Amino acid sequence: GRPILVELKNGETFNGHLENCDNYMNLTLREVIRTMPDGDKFFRLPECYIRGNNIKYLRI
Amino acid sequence: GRPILVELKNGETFNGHLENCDNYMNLTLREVIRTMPDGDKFFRLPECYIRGNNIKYLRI
Amino acid sequence: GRPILVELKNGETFNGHLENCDNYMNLTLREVIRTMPDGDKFFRLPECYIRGNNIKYLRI
């Protein structure tokens, strides 16, 4: 799966296309939908980098 | 009004063009300017979805 | 310099090309990389406005 959904420890989720990932799960997503715990969303974030340490889980 | 300004309960404002609104005031804005309570702004957010429950008021 | 790095009092940094600055250090950056204290980043923010009162320091 290039499109993945990443849930952060802070409760946010990022839904985007996987561009890079390293052995520590630091990763980059493109064309991202960011969903807040309160239900608000932001669409079409060009690119987001997420530290492996900040991730709760990832679903493909 | 297609361009509207939405002020959230968390103090942020979103200024963009109205794309959709439902009977619960869940709405979508495009080409949005987001203003933080501390004055910082982010321009040209492609699309934001805001839950009616998170809105304080809307100005047209 | 046009590319500058702005560190905010809230610990975030904004790395982008300087568009405007005023005598109070309210400024505008374009094509910006926003880095969070926890190491997550957002790339290619079209434009950000930052209030002088929110800035800790600026590096060119």
Residue numbers in the entry:
A (entry chain A), B (entry chain C), C (entry chain B): 12 to 71
Please, what does the article write about this entry?
Sm and Sm-like (Lsm) proteins have been found in all three kingdoms of life: bacteria, archaea and eukaryotes. They are essential parts of ribonucleoprotein (RNP) complexes and are actively involved in various steps of RNA metabolism including pre-mRNA splicing, mRNA degradation, telomere replication, histone formation and translational control. Members of this protein family are characterized by two closely spaced, conserved Sm motifs 1 and 2, which adopt a conserved Sm fold that consists of an N-terminal α helix followed by a twisted five-stranded β sheet. A common characteristic of Sm/Lsm proteins is their tendency to form a hepta- or hexameric ring structure.
Attempts of crystallization of full length SpLsm4 failed due to the poor solubility and low yield of the full length protein. The structure of SpLsm4N was also determined by the SAD method using the data obtained from a SeMet derivative crystal. The structure has been refined at a resolution of 2.2 Å to an R factor of 23.7% and Rfree of 25.2% with good geometry. The final model covers residues 12–71 of every molecule in the AU. Residues 1–11 and 72–91 are not visible in the electron density map and assumed to be disordered. Consistent with this notion, our structures showed that a possible arrangement of a dimer of heptamers, a trimer and a hexamer for SpLsm3, SpLsm4N and SpLsm5/6/7, respectively, in the crystal lattice. Surface plasmon resonance analysis in combination with fluorescence anisotropy analysis revealed that SpLsm2/3, and SpLsm5/6/7 bound to oligo(U) whereas no binding of oligo(U) was observed for SpLsm3 and SpLsm4N.
